[PDB]
Structure 1
Amino acid sequence: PLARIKKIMKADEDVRMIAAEAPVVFARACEMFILELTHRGWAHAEENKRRTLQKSDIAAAIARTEVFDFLVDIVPR
């Protein structure tokens, strides 16, 4: 979804032009980001012996990951 990754990249302040390679490297970076967030969420879900990945699990993944300290605005801890 190259167009939106550019649209959101320039929607939020960006410095003018975007090289064509930046959204391509971003979608892959977004792909690896969903992985780690989904890996970390389901690890919390499976540790609680639940087979359903719910909204609560992503809050736990953001909470104790210092890598995702910037995401606590979305999840009420």
Structure 2
Amino acid sequence: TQFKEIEKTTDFKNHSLPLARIKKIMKADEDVRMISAEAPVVFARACEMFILELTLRSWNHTEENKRRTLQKNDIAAAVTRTDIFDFLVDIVPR
């Protein structure tokens, strides 16, 4: 996967996912004590990249089956083939 940044008028920032909500998701692990303010900043772009790749790999399976609607079984196929997505197999079994 080749990620690339698009410099672009009409974006207020360089991310579009809420830092405060990222922080709450990291804090639900009760073993997490303290979080630098920079860590959610990293995750806000990392989550966008992860969403793009998982969506694209799922859509590859959609097109393979001659469909124009992304379905949950397409996500399941993408999680099954992509080694870095192995941590998701319980989340999307099929």
Same topology, TM > 0.5: yes
Task: Give the RMSD, CA atoms, in angstroms.
Answer: 1.2
TM-score (ref. length: structure 2): 0.76
Q: What's 1:73 paired with?
A: 90
CA distance in 2, matches of 1:15, 1:74: 22
The runs of 4+ residues in structure 1 deviating greater than 6 Å are none
Q: What's 2:11 paired with?
A: none
Please state which structure has a larger fraction of its residues in helix.
1
Aligned length: 77
TM-score (ref. length: structure 1): 0.91
Gaps of 5+ in 1: none
Identity %: 87
Gaps of 5+ in 2: 1-17
CA distance in 2, matches of 1:35, 1:13: 29
* Structure 1 residues 7 and 22: alpha-carbon distance in aligned structure 2, compared to 1, 3 A threshold: same
Q: Which moved more, 1:5-14 or 1:41-50?
A: 5-14
**Larger Rg computed on CA atoms:** 2
Task: Pick one of 12, 18, 21 that aligns with 1:4.
Answer: 21
1:31 matched to 2:74: no
